[PDB]
Design a protein around this ligand. Structure first.
Ligand SMILES: CCNc1cc2oc3c/c(=[NH+]\CC)c(C)cc-3c(-c3ccccc3C(=O)OCC)c2cc1C
Length: 158
């Protein structure tokens, strides 16, 4: 039951758009707490300016899974939005990525990374080491067998 990139994996060119982000670090064990806290505080901050997110939330990773690791997470937003405290104005990812949609629990998401790494290797692409996840559904409110995540591995320079 290994994911297959045969038909669904693709290379995307990502258009960078504005976002509000929390740029910090965490451990596997604190990641859920962190996201629930941060994602809520951002929404709160958006509402503070009578603004709404313009897209589902996302996270960026690098050197993940090992001890304490880097994470950037947030929401894409309309222009004119401003951050406050640790919530900052930045951008969504730009450039090329090897990308696939995944449906299922986040726990079994490793398989999609496996398949994406096989597919990158086969097609002779090179990775930056960065991963990009878009959480299309709120996991709290969404059945696991219906939970949509887009998984992207960022590609390296020319
Ligand atoms: C259009 C999609 N919109 C959303 C997508 C979301 O994705 C989430 C992914 C997560 N993990 C990804 C690895 C975690 C941990 C929390 C998430 C929350 C979240 C935010 C605040 C409070 C609780 C949760 C929440 O879902 O509780 C977590 C059990 C969330 C919320 C919304 C609105």
């Amino acid at each position: 039951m290994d994911f297959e990139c045969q038909f669904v994996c693709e290379l995307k060119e990502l258009a960078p758009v504005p976002a509000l982000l929390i740029r910090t670090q965490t451990t596997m064990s604190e990641l859920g707490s962190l996201f629930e806290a941060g994602y809520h505080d951002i929404l709160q901050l958006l509402a503070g300016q009578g603004k709404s997110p313009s897209g589902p939330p996302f996270a960026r990773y690098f050197g993940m899974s090992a001890g304490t690791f880097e994470v950037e997470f947030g929401f894409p937003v309309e222009g004119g939005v401003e951050g406050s405290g640790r919530v900052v104005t930045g951008l969504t990812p730009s450039g090329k990525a090897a990308s696939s949609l995944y449906i299922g629990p986040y726990g079994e998401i490793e398989a999609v990374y496996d398949a994406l790494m096989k597919w990158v290797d086969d097609n002779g692409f090179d990775l930056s080491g960065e991963a990009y996840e878009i959480y299309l559904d709120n996991p709290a409110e969404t059945a696991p067998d219906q939970l949509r995540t887009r998984v992207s591995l960022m590609l390296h320079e020319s």
